[PDB]
Design an enzyme around this catalytic site. Structure first.
Site: not given
Lengths: 423, 418
Positions: B240, B270, B304, B313, B359
């Site tokens: 992105s 993504h 990843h 994160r 995620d």
């Protein structure tokens, strides 16, 4: 027969080749990356793989092995016209074969069946302020049709499989390719021709129906057929093709990917040179000559527009085919010549006392005199013409990226501290 | 002190460094390209330059040199809440400096002035079929606002100048970033909450106003602030960010560039892993265990590509969850997965990053607070990712980074290499 069955034969003969160089030659070195290259937009780094077309710096572009004279020579011609079926060029980019008459007809019939625009695309383009740039409308139109994506639906249903995934990508590519010229024309009518519309003629080929919906007579049908073929692909490393490739790499459908590509194509450094050259020729004709023309034509600092290229080191054969067209069709148009005479005088001058890496014109030096000749004066719309053409190549390439399971594109970033440490 | 003047000082410090790298050390090699890497999506090639953030494979994302704990600790907090002003994060990404309370307040005032959504954006999203995916709406709305681009009118007016081009790019970045939350919320309300709307509260900060417009009570304001900051940037080589960077490098404006980015972000590889994790946890809760496995089947939210250890994160999300929803059933499975999945993945060897990414964790938080609309999660991601991507575009233009234009090869040419 069927394009789809035929494409599946070429996919089965291609996959082992990719498997083999991954199994056995994965580590063979192909290029280096320098600081200059990292900072300056990965310039010239051999980091992408496509087979649709290949950009030779010395020879210019070849489409599936063939040169432009060859493609134009060999592809079957629209009955009553000079130029090939654009659909036969799509057949070529997808398969690698020159289609027969029986084969092109099938693709023309399948485009006839898929070419109609959804009403909500027109609704969406009316709700967008009418003063929006035509490339924004074009990108938006493609993006709204994402609702129809077979690839997205097949993914959402859990049906994804790395052997079959090319198939709904193909279906989307056919749907989209068939519709893009009608989308472009709707935008042209709605912005520039009083918002009056000429219906699709279901007996015309892609390029002929485009001329028809645009409101422009014969031989603009051939101008378009030629224009679109010449802009069909310039390998995968150009901004627009690379953007589609990149987005598609995340398994985003062709509607997402092509809309994104038109965002890059709209950029002044990629989509605008056709118009920027034409404007500069008309402003030269008007202020730096009389009307006039003749002999005695930088150093004060400004470039000659439409000369140069990041990868082309010699004359663009896309440029040469446009020259052949104008010679045949508009010898004595004042803006062609000036174009013609720039072809003569500019390359010695850029070379003879050098510094540019590619003296030599690119297609953008030539395209705008031809469009302008036939009354397409709406400079901003030129890039939409480019977007319609370029999808032939880009969407072929996306069907193939899925066919060969190409991985998500995801290079590594470094910081300037890191580059400074290297030293 | 003013953001724009401080950015101007930063640019004037930085420019000569870039200039000296190209003049003197242009030809220093930094990496190799293999056949494997050309075919495998440039994996590992060090071919992009950005300073907004840097993704370190071991101890993960850093934002202008700082870790996530450092960013969450140092940024000024919204008065009476737990989390930073998102606007302070934006200031950090743009400048490299942690803003003072006074500097963040000036960015928040500027955001309140730029927040309003053009009514033709609403018109465009209603003309789009209501069953359109919210990401497609999201990218269409950004794209439609290309009409307002100061960078593009600047270019079209003949005013492009290599030194000054970042200025109108900055003005677009502030306009778009101020609006993205409102565009997001409007999509949420029109699609999933009966098309009824809650007006912008002009006294609230970015994150607080987003939760207000969404219709979701405290502490979703802090959920949002945190979410956005964590998703703000992951260097420039993610799809992105890179898409934006690529499109902008042809001097396309931020609206074109960020709409393109959301086309990337919508891809299943993504922007879907949040939702895929959550669904797979909820299925596993219901039918597979009321209230290991080897074969086929990948564990969602764990690989990843660049990260080779625990994503910080994910850790930041976990520490919010331990505090506000300790005995949420779904979060308990997520917590149990963090204990049980890595040992099983690493010793057993197939996946190169045997650890969670963010995620794995985002969905249980969102679901807990009433955001059940899976498809919308990517829009959240898009709102947040604009923070680093837009700061990256301003800098790409400040530094004159050239058109991105790598070279393609054929499989015949790769076969020739042997």
């Amino acid at each position: 027969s069927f394009l789809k069955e035929k494409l599946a034969e070429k996919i089965a003969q291609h996959r082992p080749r990719t498997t083999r160089l991954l199994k056995e030659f994965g580590n063979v070195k192909i290029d280096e990356v320098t600081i200059s290259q990292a900072i300056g937009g990965m310039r010239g780094i051999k980091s992408l793989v496509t087979d649709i077309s290949y950009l030779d710096p010395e020879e210019g572009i070849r489409f599936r092995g063939y040169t432009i004279p060859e493609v134009l020579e060999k592809l079957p011609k629209v009955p009553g016209a000079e130029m090939p079926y654009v659909e036969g060029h799509f057949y070529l980019l997808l398969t690698g074969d020159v289609p027969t008459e029986k084969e092109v007809k099938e693709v023309a019939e399948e485009f006839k069946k898929r070419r109609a625009l959804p009403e909500y695309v027109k609704d969406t383009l009316k709700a967008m302020p009418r003063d929006t740039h035509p490339m924004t409308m074009f990108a938006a139109g493609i993006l709204a049709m994402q609702r129809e994506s077979k690839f997205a639906a097949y993914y959402n249903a859990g049906k994804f499989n790395k052997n079959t995934a090319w198939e709904p990508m193909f279906e989307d590519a056919m749907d989209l390719m068939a519709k893009l010229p009608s989308l472009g024309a709707y935008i042209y009518r709605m912005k520039y021709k009083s918002d009056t519309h000429i219906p699709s003629n279901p007996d015309l080929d892609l390029g002929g129906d485009f001329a028809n919906m645009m409101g422009i007579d014969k031989p603009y049908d051939d101008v378009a057929r030629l224009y679109f073929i010449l802009h069909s692909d310039h390998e995968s490393g150009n901004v627009s093709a690379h953007t589609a490739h990149l987005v598609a790499s995340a398994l985003s459908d062709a509607y997402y990917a092509y809309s994104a590509a038109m965002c890059g194509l709209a950029g002044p450094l990629h989509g605008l040179a056709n118009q920027e050259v034409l404007k500069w020729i008309q402003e030269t004709i008007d202020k730096k000559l009389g009307g006039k023309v003749p002999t005695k034509e930088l150093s004060s600092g400004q470039v000659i527009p439409g000369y140069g290229h990041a990868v082309l080191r010699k004359t663009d054969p896309r440029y040469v085919a446009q020259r052949e067209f104008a010679l045949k069709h508009m010898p004595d148009d004042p803006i062609f010549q000036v174009v013609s005479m720039l072809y003569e005088v500019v390359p010695p001058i850029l070379s003879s006392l050098g510094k540019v890496k590619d003296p030599w014109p690119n297609v953008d030096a030539h395209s705008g005199c031809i469009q302008w000749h036939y009354g397409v004066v709406e400079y901003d719309f030129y890039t939409v013409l480019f977007g319609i053409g370029r999808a032939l190549g880009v969407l072929a390439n996306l069907v193939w990226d899925r066919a060969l399971g190409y991985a998500i594109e995801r290079p590594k970033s470094v910081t300037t501290d890191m580059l400074e440490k290297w030293a």
